[PDB]
Structure formats: structure tokens, C-alpha cells
């Protein structure tokens, strides 16, 4: 237990933060990603990447959908900088931006097994740099033709389980991080 819900998240007022938006079972019914990296460690590195760039990291838990684009959209709505990072329990990550359609993004990490703790920090760093209106070069592409063979069934099962915690119309919760 390292995440506490501290009330309905409110809209940021200044271009000085990145929202990290996590799915409804993140750090709760699920506590590691598809390849066993602890949610605690993932959150730690993304927050450090953001802060590394002199930007605030603010964490929310999303309920209205478990889809990572919709998760990240909930967060971009509330982000002072318009920039958000959506993360599912299984680890799939997206950097999104107020103004973009739900299924468009700035950068996407669509093969969670390939992510490392070093990737997550790089992801936070890029998110902050977007926030600051720089044009960061994207995190280098990770791809592997055997990722779906090895992991897609497991990814489906973990997504089914997180999806059980979806709550239509429930606004995101701001989270305190231990």
C-alpha cells in the first residue's frame, strides 16, 4: 500500500506540472506490471524523470475507463500543462496532450513487456520536456515480433481484471504517494 486517495483531482492552473494518470487497479489489486516490475518502482522512476526536468509530478487514479488512452485523457484534462502520462497496471504507457483525440498521442509504449525502469524515467523526462514546450526527441522505439506471442494472452487477462474496477462517471482521484 503506497497510494492514498486524497479527493477528487482538480484542474491544474499553471504550466508547471505533468499528471501521471493510473488505471483503477494500479497499486491495488495489481502491484507489478506484466513482466513483474513493481508499481511502486514504476511510479518512482516516472516521477523522478519529471522532477528531473524541474516540473511538478501529480498523480491521479482514473475510473471511467481502463483503456490507457482514456486514462491519459482524464489526466490531460486536469493537467496544468495539458500534458499527461497514462499507465495501466500491466504497464502500457502513453504520453498524451490536451487537444489531441483520445487515440492520438505524443508518444506511445504499446509493448509493455519491453519497458524497463530506465524507460519509465525517460518517459517522465520527455513528458516534462513537452510540458515545457521543448521538442524532445522521442524515447527510442522498442519493438519485438515475439512480444505478442509471449505476452498478449497474459496482457488480455490482466486487462480483464483491472477493468473490473472501472466505474462509469466517477471522476479521478488525486493520489498521495508514500
Amino acid at each position: 500500500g503506497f497510494l492514498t486517495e486524497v479527493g477528487e483531482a482538480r484542474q491544474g492552473t499553471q504550466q508547471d506540472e505533468v499528471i501521471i494518470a493510473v488505471g483503477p487497479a494500479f497499486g491495488l489489486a495489481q502491484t507489478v506490471n506484466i513482466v513483474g516490475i513493481p508499481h511502486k518502482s514504476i511510479l518512482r522512476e516516472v516521477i523522478a524523470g519529471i522532477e528531473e526536468e524541474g516540473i511538478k509530478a501529480r498523480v491521479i487514479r482514473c475510473f471511467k475507463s481502463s483503456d490507457v488512452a482514456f486514462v491519459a485523457v482524464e489526466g490531460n484534462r486536469l493537467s496544468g500543462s495539458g500534458i499527461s502520462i497514462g499507465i495501466q497496471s500491466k504497464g502500457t504507457t502513453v504520453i498524451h496532450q490536451q487537444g489531441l483525440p483520445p487515440l492520438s498521442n505524443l508518444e506511445l509504449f504499446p509493448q509493455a513487456p519491453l519497458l524497463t525502469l530506465e524507460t519509465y524515467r525517460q518517459i517522465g523526462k520527455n513528458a516534462a520536456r513537452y510540458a515545457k514546450r521543448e521538442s524532445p526527441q522521442p524515447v527510442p522505439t522498442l519493438n519485438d515480433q515475439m512480444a505478442r506471442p509471449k505476452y498478449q494472452a497474459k496482457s488480455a487477462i490482466l486487462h480483464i481484471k483491472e477493468t473490473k474496477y472501472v466505474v462509469t462517471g466517477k471522476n479521478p482521484q488525486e493520489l498521495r504517494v508514500a
Binding site: 471511467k64 475507463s65 483525440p101 462509469t168 462517471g169
Partner: protein, 137 residues
């Protein structure tokens, strides 16, 4: 009324296919592209062509394909950006009912797109029922 005996139009009746702006297929030459005698705005399928194809589809036993072609014929009159606006309007949680009904009124009164107007009012009604309107997520 076109039948499958009339297909392909390009071989069977190229004349039937004369564009947006009265250019013929044969007007689209490299030479005319290069002299700008013909441009992108000339290169547009017509509502007539699509309704002909709709008749051929029906003759081929594909009524829903024909109906798609009939809707497309109407939409040839709608500008590219307005097409994208209306498509996005139909996506979940984008629109209020009144906004969909107004897209529908506009389809009909500005573009005579009566089938597409009916299509959009149908979605509005069902979007209420299944809760896919703005605010329902």
C-alpha cells in the same frame, strides 16, 4: 438504371463519369495536370457516379452496399473539414443531442443530404438511450 452489365463504368460507359466540374476521364492527362488545366478540385467523384454504382451494387444483390453509396453521393457536397467535424461529432461522448440534431438539420437544408440527416437523427435518438452523448461517460 445501371446493372452489372454496365460495369465497369470506365470500360462500359466512361462518359457517364464526368466529374465535379465537367471534366471527362480523358481530360485527366499529365499535360493538363502540368498546365493546371485540371486540378485537385476537378478530380472529384460525383453524386451521379456514386448513384450509378449504387444501382450496380443492388443489381449485384448488395443492397446495404448500395445504401452506403447513396449516403456517399450525398456527402460529396459536404466539404472535407465538415465531413471530419461530423464524423468526430458521432464518436462517443463528443456531442449533445441538440448538437447532433443540428448537424442533421444542416445536412438536409444546406446539402440536401436527407439520408445522412436521417442517419444522424437515428444516432442521436439511440445515443440518448445507450448513453453515448457528452457527459454520459
Amino acid at each position: 438504371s445501371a446493372r452489372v452489365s454496365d460495369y465497369p463504368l470506365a470500360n462500359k460507359h466512361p462518359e457517364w463519369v464526368k466529374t465535379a466540374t465537367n471534366k471527362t476521364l480523358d481530360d485527366f492527362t499529365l499535360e493538363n495536370v502540368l498546365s493546371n488545366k485540371v486540378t485537385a478540385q476537378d478530380m472529384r467523384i460525383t453524386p451521379e457516379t456514386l448513384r450509378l454504382q449504387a444501382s450496380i451494387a443492388k443489381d449485384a444483390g448488395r443492397d446495404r452496399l448500395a445504401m452506403n453509396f447513396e449516403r456517399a453521393a450525398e456527402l460529396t457536397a459536404v466539404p472535407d473539414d465538415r465531413i471530419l467535424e461530423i464524423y468526430n461529432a458521432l464518436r462517443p461522448y463528443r456531442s449533445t443531442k441538440e448538437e447532433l440534431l443540428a448537424i442533421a438539420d444542416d445536412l438536409e437544408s444546406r446539402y440536401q443530404a436527407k439520408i445522412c440527416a436521417a442517419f444522424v437523427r437515428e444516432a442521436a435518438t439511440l445515443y440518448v438511450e445507450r448513453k453515448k452523448l457528452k457527459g454520459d461517460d
